[PDB]
Design an enzyme around this catalytic site. Structure first.
Site, PDB file in Angstrom:
ATOM      1  N   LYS A  63      30.262  33.377   9.462  1.00 50.59           N
ATOM      2  CA  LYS A  63      30.535  34.726   9.939  1.00 50.59           C
ATOM      3  C   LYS A  63      29.568  35.079  11.053  1.00 50.59           C
ATOM      4  CE  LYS A  63      29.998  35.667   5.588  1.00 50.59           C
ATOM      5  NZ  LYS A  63      29.494  36.580   4.528  1.00 50.59           N
ATOM      6  N   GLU A 107      21.008  41.973   6.694  1.00 52.02           N
ATOM      7  CA  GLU A 107      21.079  40.624   7.236  1.00 52.02           C
ATOM      8  C   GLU A 107      19.667  40.154   7.564  1.00 52.02           C
ATOM      9  OE1 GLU A 107      23.260  40.514  10.921  1.00 52.02           O
ATOM     10  OE2 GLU A 107      21.575  41.357  12.040  1.00 52.02           O
ATOM     11  N   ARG A 108      19.553  38.887   7.953  1.00 51.13           N
ATOM     12  CA  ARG A 108      18.237  38.304   8.175  1.00 51.13           C
ATOM     13  C   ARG A 108      17.576  38.800   9.459  1.00 51.13           C
ATOM     14  NH1 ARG A 108      21.512  33.679   6.145  1.00 51.13           N
ATOM     15  NH2 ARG A 108      21.512  32.438   8.073  1.00 51.13           N
TER      16      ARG A 108
END
Lengths: 507, 40, 151, 180, 49, 475, 479
Positions: free
Chosen positions: F154, F180-181
Site C-alpha cells: 500500500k 504510520e512509520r
C-alpha cells in the site's frame, strides 16, 4: 415573503413578550441525552430543546428519560431546558412529495421550496389485519427479462434483493423505477399508475445525487420520491427513514392507488438500531445486535399489503436490499429478512464476472407468489425457459469436461446457452412486456440455437427495432389482450421469419 | 469441489439414465404389448 | 425563466436571513455595551426581578430599537461601523442588495460602454448593419451571451 | 428514590410520626455545619482505617456530648451497619432540599456584590409571598456571569427561577434567530 | 417530436404565485412582459405555418 | 473558564467546572504540565462534570491540576503558508523551521456540505498503472481505496501514485499519516524536497521561505495516543477544505492507515464507558466514519480527490471497519497476499477490485469489453483451481488449457516495476499509457501472444518489452 | 380490583408499582387511558411492591404514572362451540370483523400438564394420503408430529395438504395457530377453509352472522404483533383445544405454524427482563418453557390431541438449540431438505432424517417394516456411491451397483407426488395415495418388477398405474 422594517420588526416586537411541563438535561453524549423530568411523556414522542434541535424519547426510566437526538450533541449543554410537544413522531404524506428529496422527517433537502402537504401520518403504526387484504393477482413490471419471466413480482409483495457488494442491486431497483414512466405517461388512471419511493439508508450523498441525476435524465422523478438518511445523518434518522417511507406509501396503499418502495442498504438500519441500543445501555445479543431485530423488520415489512375492494384496492410492494459478506446467508440479519419475505433474488459475483448481468442466480432466487403475479403470455414462455435452464444447469457442469454427448443433450446445451445469452441486459435499458415476450419467443422456439451466442446480443437489438418499426400492432395486441392467440402466434412467427430472411448472422 | 463433484455426478447420471430410458422406451412396447394403448 | 425565479427567490430569502441575523447581533452587542455603561439599568433590573417574583430593561431596549428601526428606510443610511444600529445594519443591507442586483441585473457601466462606443457609431435612423465595425463585434456577441444568460 | 433519598424519606416519616421534627431539624443543620467546618469529621467519615466499633463509639460520644435524639443515632448506626456513612452529607442535602419542609425552607441565591438591607427585605418578602412558607432561611452567594439581576434557587429542584440579565438575553437572542 | 408532444403542456407558469412570493416586483414585471411578448409571436408563427 | 482534574484514566480525563460548563468538542489546555496538553470534550456526565480525550500523554497529571477552557474547538491554521509544511493535530509545526504565520484558523470539526451543494461529474485519472487504468479506473474528484493487510504494497502504491499524479497535477495536495512509520514519513518529506514538491529555502537570518510548495503534511503516527490519532484526518480535511472552499482549487488528499482512526476509538471507548460491539468496536463505528467521509466530496466550489489506505486485520475483509468503509468509496483496489507470494507486484486482485467509472458511458466500449473479457477469463481460471490442485492440468480439455494459459499470461502481464521500488528491485520504472495496455490485452485475449512463454510477461510494461524478453530468452 | 401505576417503560417490558395486594405472577393487567385495549402479563417480582410485565400490544403512547388494573387471573380466552369457524387473537379478541364471541365460558391459557397417571392410548395409524409419510414416517393418531425445515421447502404447503386430507374427513373439531407467520398465508388459509366447507359463514339480514358447523378454530399471533403475543398465542390455542379434549371428550387436531417464533419471542425480551443470555443468544428458560407447552399436548383417558408443529430451522442447521430440544418432544418427525427440493422432488422429505416411534414390526406389520428398512438401506447404498460416481464415473460400477442406483433413483422420483394446493405452482392435479397401494408399489420396485420401465415416469405419480401410463406416453411420443 415580507419586508424587513415595517413587518419583521413589528413581528419580533410582538414576539418578545414572555415571563414565568418542562425538564432539564442531566447527561449528554454521542447524540443521546438523559433528562430528569417530564413525567407525562409518551414513549416515542418528539422532544424540543432550547436551541432548535429535536429528539425522540424512547427509554422512560424511573429516574431519568432517554432521548435520542436528530443531530449533533454540541448544542446540548447538560442543564438546557427541554419541552415536550405531545406529538408522536410523524411525517407528511401526499403528492407534494413526488419529485422531491426529503430527509427521514419530511424536511426537504433539494433546496427548492418547502413541502406543500397538509395531512401528516404517524411513523410507527399497526399493519393491516387478515380481513382487509386479498390475494396477489396483478404483476409489477420490473423491466428486466429474468425477473419478469422466472422470478415474477406482484403488487402487494415483499421481495428481497440479496447479494454481495457491487453486484447490481441498486441497478435492478433503478430499472424497475425507470420502466414505469411509459406505463404512467400512457394513462391518466391513478389506479393503474405506479408511484415509487426510494429509501437510501447509509448511502453517501454523492450516490444519492447520481441516482437523482439518472432519474431526471430519463424524466423518472414525476412519479417517484426519495428519502435520504445518509451516513452523516444521525442514527435515529437512519432508523426512522424506512418507516417514514412506509408512511408515505400508505397514502397510496389506502387511497386506492398503487406504489412500490425500495429500501436500499437495509442493514444500515440494523446497524443504527444496534448503535442506539448500545448507547442507551440496552444489552446486546449475538454479533452485538439486540433481540428486537425481528420486531424491527416485521413492523416495517408487514405494512406492505394488497387491500380489498372495500378498502380501495390499493397496494404497497416492497423490494428490500441486503449486502452479505463472503456470500454468507447463514448470518442473522439475512436469515431474519429471508424468513419474513415472499421471495428471494440472489446476486453473485461469479455470475457477475462470468458475463451474466444482471447476475441473478435463478436457482436460489424464488418467488412464492409466482405465476399469479405473471401474465399468461409470459407464463407460456417462462415455463419452458425455466425447464430448459434447469436442465442446462444440471448437465453443463458434466458437459464442460470435453465428453461427447448425443444430440438430444447437445440441443439442451445449445438452448441453455442461447437463453443465458438472451437474459443479459445493459444497465438502465429496460424493456416492455410485449417485447420481452417476443424476444423469449424467438429464444424458446429455436430461432437462436444455430445462431452464434456472441451474435445474440445484436440479434436481440435489431429484432427489437424491427418489431418496433413494422409490427407495432402485435405489441399493442399483446399489451391489451395479455395473451397469445393463434393469430398473434402466427404473426410473430412470420415476423421472425421475415427478420431472419432480411438479415444474416454468423450461423 | 463440493458443488463441482455434485454437479458432475448429477450430469453424468442424467446422461447415463437418459440413454437407458431411451433404450427402455424403445424396447418396452414389444416385450409388453398388453400396455401399449396402440393395441387397445 | 423558472430557474431564474427560483434563483432570485433563494437570493431574497438568504438576504433576509442574513439581515435579521445581523439585526439581532448588533442589538445584542449594543445592549451589552449600554448595560455595562449605565448605572441605572442595574437597579432597574433589580426592581424588575423583585416585582417579577409576584417591563425589564432588556425587553424595553430591544423593543425600542426595533420600533426605531421599523421606520428607517435603510436605503437612506451610512457606513458600516457608524454606531447607531440602523447605521450598522443598513450598510449590510445595501451592500448585499448591490451584490444581488449585480448578479441578477445588468450594470449601467456595461450598458454605457457599448451604448456610447459600439452601437450608435455604426449608424443612426435604424442602426442598419454591422460590417461597419471592428473585430470587437465578437466581444459584443460575448456580451450578449453574458447578458441574456444572467437575466 | 436514591439511597440517600430512601434514608431521608424514612427519617422524615418517622420524625413526623413519633418524636418531633424540630429536634432532628436542628440536628441535621448542626451535623452539616460540623461536617463543613471541622474539616476532620469528613475524613473520619470517609476513611476506612476507622473500625466500625470506633465509628459507633465516636457517634455515641457525639450523641451524649450534644443535643441529640435517638432517631438520628439509629440513622447513623444504620448507615454504619450498611456502609453508608460517606452518604451523610448527601442525605443531609436531600433532607434539606425537598424538604426539611414543614417549618421552613433553605434556598440558595446569587448576586454580583453586596446588596442593601432595603432590597434584601424586598427580596425576602417577595420570595415569602411567592412561597407562602412562613419560615425561610436563605443563602447569599456571588457569581457575576448573571450580571447583577437576582438569580436563585428556592430549594425544591423543579423551581429554579432564573431572573437574570445574561440568561434572559441569550434565551431571547436564540429565540429571535428563528426563521421568519 | 414524440418528446415534445408526450407531456403536451405541463409548464404553463402562473405569475400569481411569484408576484406574491417575491418582494421586488420591478424586474419580474419586465421579465413577464418579455415572456408574454415572445409567446405571442411563437403562437403566431405556429398558426401561420 | 477554569476547571479541576478529578480523575484520570489513560487517555481519558474527567474535569470539574464550578460556574459554567463548556460545550462538547471544545478544547481545554492543561497548565500545570511540562508540554502543551490539550483535551477535547466528548461527553457530559452531570455534577458539572466533563469527560475529555487527551492529545498527548497523561503521565504526570494530578487529581487537582488546573485546566482552562479555550471556548472553541481545536483550531488549525490555513492559507498558502501551510503548504510545504508538516503540522501535527494541534497545528503545532514539528518541522523545526519556525512558526506558521497564517492569518486565518479553521476548526477541526465542521459540518459536511449539504445535498444540493454537490456535483458528481465523471472524470478519470492517469495513474500510469496498468491494473487500475484498465480494470479499476480512478475517478477525478472522487474517493479511492487501497485495501490490504501488512506487507502487500500500500505504501509503495501510494508513493507511486504520488510520483505519477501530484508532480503532474499543478494544483495543491495534502498527505495525512494516521499511525504510520516515522521512517516513511521522513522519506516522503525528503523525496518531496528532492522532487521540488516542497521548496525549502534558508534565508540568511535563519528564517525560511517555502514559497513554491505544492503539498501539505499532517502526521499523527504510532508514537501518539489515540486522541492524537483519531483527530489528525480531521485536521488534514480542514486544511484541504480551506483550499477547495475559498481558493476554489482542486486538491488531492492521500491518507495512510485510516484504520487507526477506528483503532484509537477502540482503545478509548472502553475508558469512556461504552459497551463494545461485536469485535470490540464501537456502536458509533459507522457514524464516526461517515462524518469524516461526507466532508470529502466534490462540490460546485472545488474538488477533493482522495486516496485512502485501509488496513485489513488478519487478512479479514469481513471486519466491520473495512465493511463500513467499502460503502463510502467511488473506486476500490483490494491487494492480496496470495498474489504477492507469486512475486506479482502490484498484488492487486482484479476481481475484488471494482469501480463506478467502468461503464461504457464513461470509458469506451472497447475498454469496457476488454475489461469484462479479462474478468471473465480470470474467473474461469479461478473456477479450475481446485481441480488443478487435486488432479492436474492434464485432466482439462484444450479450451480450458488455453484459458489457463491466457489467464496466467495476463496475470503476469498485469505486473509493473515501479520507480520507488528500484531501491529493492533494481529494475527501472515503466510508465504505461492506457491504449497500449488495451491493445496488449486485446492481443493476449485474441491469441496473438500464445507463442510466447509465460515468464516473458513478468515486469515488462508494454508488449514490445515482452517480445524483446522472449527473444532474449530464446537464446 | 387493585390499582397500580406504571413506573418505567422499556420496549415490551413495563414496570408497575402497587400500593398493596401485589398480583401473583402471570396475572393480567389492563392499562387505563390508552387508545386501544392494552394488556400486560406479569413475569417477575422485583421488590418494593413492584412487578415487571410484558405487553401484548405496542407500548407506543404509554406514560409514566398511567393507571393499571389487575384482573385477578391470567389471560382468559373464551371457549365453546362459539369459537368454531372463527379467528381469535392472543387475548381472545376476534379479528375477523364479524362480531364478538358469544361464549358462555372462558379458560386460562396457563394450566398444568396432565400427570404421568393419565396415560396415552394405542399408537393409532393416521392416513394422510402422502406416500413417503405413510410409508417411512407413519403419523400417530394421538401423538405429536414435527415438520422441520428452513425457508422454501414446503412446510405451510405440507400443512395445507394435511389439512385438506385430514381435517375435512375428521369428525371432531380442529385448531390452527399461526405463530409469527405471514399474513398473506393467514388470509389464504382462511379463504381456503371458507371455500372447502371447513368454515361455514352465513350473514343475516339483521347484520349478524351464523358459523353453525364450521369444525375449525383459528388463532393468530402473527409477525406484526410484538413479543408477549407470539409467545402466549400458542397457549391460547392449546387451551382452546384442551377445552374440547377434556370436557367434550372429542378427538382434536392442532396445527401450529412456526413454533420457533415462541422461542424467538422469548429471546427478544429475556435480556430486558434481566436474564443472562445462553449459548447462541437464546434464553436460559428454553427447555422448561417448551416442555410446559408440549406436555399439555398429549392424549389422555378423556380425549386426544393430534398435533402437527412446523419448526423453522435457520440456515438448515439441525444443531441449533431450539430444534435440538424440540426433537425430543415429538412422536413423529419429518425433516425437509433443500438438496432434494433442488431436484424437483416435492415433497422434499429426507427419508434418512425422517423417523417415527410407530415404525416397529408390532404396530405396522413386517411387510411395512421390512419394506421401509429396505428402502432406507437402498437409499443409503446409493448415497455411499456419490463420490465414486463423481470421481471415476458410472463405467467403474458393477451391474449390481448400477441396478442399485437405478432402483434408488426410481424410489426417489416415486416418493414425489403432486398436492392439490400446489396446482397454482405445477398446474397438475392432486393425488391421494393409500398405504396398501404405497406398500405394493414399493415392494414391486424393490423386487425388480419395474426395471423395464424408465425413470421419468415417477416424479409426479401416485401409484404404479400412473407410472406405467407415463412410460407408455413417453414411449408413444418417442415414435
Amino acid at each position: 415573503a415580507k419586508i424587513s422594517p415595517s413587518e419583521m420588526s413589528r413581528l419580533l416586537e410582538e414576539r418578545i413578550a414572555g415571563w414565568k411541563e418542562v425538564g432539564r438535561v442531566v447527561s449528554v453524549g454521542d447524540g443521546i441525552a438523559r433528562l430528569f423530568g417530564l413525567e407525562g411523556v409518551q414513549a416515542g414522542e418528539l422532544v424540543e430543546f432550547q436551541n432548535g434541535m429535536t429528539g425522540m424519547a424512547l427509554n422512560l426510566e424511573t429516574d431519568n428519560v432517554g432521548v435520542v437526538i436528530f443531530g449533533d450533541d454540541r448544542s446540548v449543554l447538560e442543564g438546557d431546558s427541554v419541552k415536550r410537544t405531545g406529538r408522536i413522531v410523524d411525517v407528511p404524506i401526499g403528492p407534494g412529495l413526488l419529485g422531491r428529496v426529503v430527509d427521514a422527517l419530511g424536511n426537504p433537502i433539494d433546496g427548492k421550496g418547502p413541502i406543500p402537504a397538509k395531512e401528516r401520518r404517524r411513523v410507527e403504526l399497526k399493519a393491516p389485519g387478515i380481513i382487509p387484504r386479498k390475494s396477489v393477482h396483478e404483476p409489477m413490471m420490473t423491466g428486466l427479462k429474468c425477473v419478469d419471466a422466472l422470478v415474477p413480482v406482484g403488487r402487494g409483495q415483499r421481495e428481497l434483493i440479496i447479494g454481495d457488494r457491487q453486484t447490481g442491486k441498486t441497478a435492478v431497483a433503478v430499472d424497475a423505477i425507470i420502466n414505469q414512466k411509459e406505463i404512467n405517461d400512457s394513462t391518466d388512471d391513478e389506479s393503474k399508475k405506479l408511484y415509487c419511493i426510494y429509501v437510501a439508508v447509509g448511502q453517501k450523498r454523492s450516490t444519492v445525487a447520481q441516482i437523482v441525476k439518472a432519474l431526471e435524465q430519463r424524466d423518472a422523478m414525476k412519479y417517484t420520491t426519495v428519502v435520504a438518511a445518509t451516513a452523516s445523518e444521525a442514527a435515529p434518522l437512519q432508523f426512522l427513514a424506512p418507516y417514514s417511507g412506509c408512511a408515505m406509501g400508505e397514502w397510496f396503499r389506502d387511497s386506492g392507488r398503487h406504489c412500490v418502495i425500495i429500501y436500499d442498504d437495509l442493514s444500515k438500519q440494523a446497524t443504527a438500531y444496534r448503535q442506539m441500543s448500545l448507547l442507551l445501555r440496552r444489552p446486546p445479543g449475538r454479533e452485538a445486535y439486540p433481540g428486537d431485530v425481528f420486531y424491527l423488520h416485521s413492523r416495517l415489512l408487514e405494512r406492505a399489503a394488497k387491500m380489498g375492494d372495500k378498502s380501495g384496492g390499493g397496494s404497497l410492494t416492497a423490494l428490500p436490499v441486503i449486502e452479505t459478506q463472503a456470500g454468507d446467508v447463514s448470518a442473522y440479519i439475512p436469515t431474519n429478512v429471508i424468513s419474513i419475505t415472499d421471495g428471494q433474488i440472489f446476486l453473485e459475483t461469479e455470475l457477475f464476472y462470468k458475463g451474466i448481468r444482471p447476475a441473478i442466480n435463478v436457482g436460489l432466487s424464488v418467488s412464492r407468489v409466482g405465476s399469479a403475479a405473471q401474465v399468461k403470455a409470459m407464463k407460456q414462455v417462462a415455463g419452458t425457459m425455466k425447464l430448459e435452464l434447469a436442465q442446462y444447469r444440471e448437465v453443463a457442469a458434466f458437459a464442460q469436461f470435453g465428453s461427447d454427448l448425443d444430440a438430444s443433450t447437445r440441443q439442451l446445451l445449445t438452448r441453455g446457452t442461447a437463453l443465458t445469452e438472451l437474459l443479459k441486459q445493459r444497465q438502465y435499458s429496460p424493456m416492455k412486456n410485449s417485447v420481452q415476450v417476443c424476444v423469449l419467443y424467438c429464444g424458446v422456439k429455436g430461432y437462436l440455437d444455430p445462431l452464434d451466442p456472441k451474435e445474440i446480443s445484436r440479434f436481440e437489438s435489431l429484432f427489437i427495432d424491427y418489431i418496433n418499426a413494422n409490427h407495432q400492432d402485435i405489441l399493442k395486441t399483446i399489451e391489451t389482450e395479455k395473451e397469445l392467440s393463434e393469430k398473434t402466434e402466427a404473426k410473430l412467427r412470420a415476423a421472425v421469419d421475415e427478420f431472419v430472411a432480411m438479415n444474416e448472422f454468423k450461423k | 469441489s463440493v458443488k463441482f463433484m455434485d454437479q458432475k455426478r448429477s450430469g453424468e447420471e442424467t446422461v447415463y439414465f437418459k440413454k437407458e430410458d431411451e433404450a427402455l422406451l424403445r424396447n418396452l412396447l414389444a416385450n409388453h404389448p398388453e400396455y401399449d394403448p396402440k393395441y387397445s | 425563466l423558472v430557474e431564474k425565479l427560483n434563483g432570485i427567490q433563494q437570493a431574497e430569502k438568504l438576504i433576509q436571513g442574513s439581515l435579521q441575523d445581523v439585526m439581532i447581533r448588533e442589538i445584542v452587542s449594543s445592549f451589552k455595551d449600554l448595560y455595562k455603561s449605565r448605572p441605572e439599568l442595574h437597579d432597574a433590573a433589580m426592581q424588575s426581578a423583585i416585582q417579577g417574583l409576584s417591563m425589564d430593561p432588556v425587553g424595553a431596549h430591544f423593543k425600542a430599537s426595533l420600533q426605531e428601526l421599523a421606520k428607517v428606510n435603510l436605503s437612506t443610511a451610512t457606513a458600516d461601523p457608524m454606531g447607531t444600529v440602523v447605521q450598522r445594519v443598513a450598510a449590510v443591507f445595501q451592500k448585499r442588495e448591490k451584490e444581488f442586483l449585480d448578479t441578477f441585473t445588468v450594470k449601467a457601466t456595461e450598458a454605457q460602454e457599448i451604448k456610447t462606443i459600439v452601437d450608435k457609431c455604426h449608424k443612426g435612423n435604424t442602426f442598419d448593419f454591422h460590417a461597419l465595425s471592428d473585430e470587437e463585434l465578437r466581444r459584443l456577441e460575448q456580451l450578449y451571451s453574458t447578458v441574456n444568460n444572467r437575466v | 428514590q436514591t439511597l440517600e433519598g430512601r434514608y431521608a424519606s424514612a427519617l422524615f416519616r418517622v420524625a413526623k410520626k413519633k418524636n418531633q421534627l424540630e429536634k432532628v431539624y436542628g440536628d441535621l443543620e448542626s451535623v452539616r455545619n460540623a461536617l463543613k467546618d471541622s474539616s476532620e469529621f469528613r475524613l473520619f467519615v470517609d476513611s476506612p482505617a476507622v473500625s466500625v466499633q470506633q465509628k459507633l463509639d465516636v457517634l455515641r460520644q457525639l450523641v451524649n456530648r450534644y443535643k441529640f435524639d435517638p432517631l438520628t443515632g439509629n440513622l447513623l448506626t444504620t448507615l454504619v451497619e450498611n456502609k453508608r456513612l460517606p452518604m451523610l452529607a448527601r442525605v443531609a442535602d436531600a433532607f434539606d432540599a425537598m424538604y426539611r419542609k414543614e417549618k421552613g425552607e433553605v434556598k440558595c441565591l446569587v448576586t454580583s456584590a453586596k446588596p442593601l438591607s432595603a432590597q434584601q427585605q424586598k427580596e425576602i418578602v417577595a420570595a415569602l409571598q411567592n412561597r407562602a412558607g412562613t419560615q425561610a432561611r436563605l443563602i447569599i452567594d456571588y457569581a457575576v456571569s448573571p450580571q447583577i439581576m437576582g438569580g436563585l434557587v428556592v430549594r425544591l429542584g423543579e423551581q429554579v427561577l432564573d431572573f437574570s440579565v445574561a440568561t434572559r438575553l441569550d434565551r431571547l437572542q436564540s429565540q429571535l434567530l428563528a426563521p421568519l | 417530436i414524440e418528446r415534445q408532444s408526450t407531456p403536451g403542456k405541463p409548464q404553463q407558469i402562473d405569475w400569481a404565485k411569484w408576484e406574491s412570493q417575491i418582494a421586488h416586483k420591478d424586474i419580474l414585471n419586465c421579465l413577464k412582459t418579455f415572456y408574454t411578448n415572445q409567446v405571442q409571436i411563437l403562437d403566431r408563427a405556429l398558426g401561420a405555418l | 473558564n477554569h476547571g479541576r482534574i478529578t480523575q484520570v484514566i489513560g487517555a481519558v480525563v474527567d474535569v470539574h467546572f464550578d460556574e459554567q460548563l463548556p460545550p462538547i468538542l471544545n478544547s481545554l489546555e492543561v497548565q500545570g504540565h511540562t508540554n502543551r496538553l490539550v483535551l477535547e470534550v466528548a461527553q457530559h456526565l452531570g455534577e458539572n462534570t466533563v469527560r475529555t480525550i487527551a492529545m498527548d500523554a497523561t503521565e504526570g497529571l494530578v487529581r487537582g491540576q488546573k485546566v482552562v477552557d479555550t471556548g472553541a474547538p481545536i483550531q488549525v491554521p490555513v492559507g498558502v503558508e501551510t503548504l510545504g509544511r508538516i503540522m501535527n493535530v494541534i497545528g503545532e509545526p514539528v518541522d523545526e523551521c519556525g512558526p506558521v504565520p497564517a492569518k486565518k484558523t479553521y476548526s477541526i470539526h465542521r459540518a459536511a456540505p449539504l445535498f444540493a451543494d454537490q456535483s458528481t461529474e465523471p472524470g478519470l485519472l492517469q495513474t500510469g498503472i496498468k491494473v487500475v487504468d484498465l480494470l479499476a479506473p480512478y475517478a477525478k474528484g472522487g474517493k479511492i481505496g487501497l485495501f490490504g493487510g501488512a506487507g502487500v504494497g500500500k505504501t509503495v502504491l501510494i508513493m507511486e501514485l504520488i510520483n505519477n499524479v501530484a508532480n503532474k497535477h499543478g494544483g495543491f495536495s495534502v498527505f495525512a499519516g494516521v499511525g504510520e512509520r516515522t521512517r516513511e514519513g521522513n522519506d516522503l518529506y525528503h523525496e518531496m524536497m528532492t522532487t521540488g514538491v516542497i521548496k525549502r529555502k534558508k534565508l540568511e537570518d535563519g528564517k525560511f521561505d517555502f514559497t513554491g510548495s505544492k503539498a501539505a503534511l499532517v502526521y499523527g503516527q504510532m508514537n501518539e495516543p489515540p486522541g492524537a490519532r483519531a483527530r489528525v484526518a480531521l485536521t488534514a480535511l480542514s486544511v484541504a477544505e480551506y483550499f477547495r472552499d475559498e481558493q476554489g482549487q482542486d486538491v488531492l488528499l492521500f491518507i495512510d492507515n485510516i484504520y487507526r482512526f477506528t483503532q484509537a476509538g477502540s482503545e478509548v471507548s472502553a475508558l469512556l464507558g461504552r459497551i463494545p460491539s461485536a469485535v470490540g468496536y464501537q456502536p458509533t463505528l459507522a457514524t464516526d466514519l461517515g462524518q469524516l467521509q461526507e466532508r470529502i466530496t466534490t462540490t460546485k466550489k472545488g474538488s477533493i480527490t482522495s486516496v485512502q489506505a485501509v488496513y485489513v486485520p488478519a487478512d479479514d475483509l469481513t471486519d466491520p471497519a473495512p465493511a463500513t468503509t467499502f460503502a463510502h468509496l467511488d473506486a476500490t483496489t483490494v491487494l492480496s497476499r496470495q498474489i504477492a507470494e507469486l512475486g506479482i507486484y502490484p498484488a492487486v486482485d482484479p476481481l475484488d477490485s471494482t469501480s463506478r467509472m467502468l461503464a461504457p458511458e464513461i470509458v469506451g466500449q472497447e475498454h469496457y469489453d476488454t475489461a469484462r473479457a479479462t474478468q471473465k477469463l480470470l474467473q474461469d481460471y479461478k473456477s479450475l483451481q481446485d481441480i488443478i490442485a487435486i488432479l492436474g492440468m492434464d485432466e482439462l480439455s484444450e479450451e480450458d488449457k488455453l484459458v489457463v494459459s491466457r489467464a496466467r499470461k495476463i496475470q503476469r502481464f498485469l505486473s509493473q516495476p515501479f520507480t520507488v521500488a528500484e531501491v529493492f528491485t533494481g529494475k527501472p520504472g515503466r510508465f504505461v499509457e492506457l491504449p497500449e495496455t488495451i491493445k496488449s490485452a486485446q492481443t493476449i485475449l485474441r491469441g496473438e501472444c500464445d507463442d510466447l512463454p509465460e515468464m516473458a510477461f513478468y515486469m515488462c510494461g508494454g508488449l514490445e518489452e515482452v517480445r524483446s524478453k522472449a527473444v532474449k530468452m530464446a537464446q
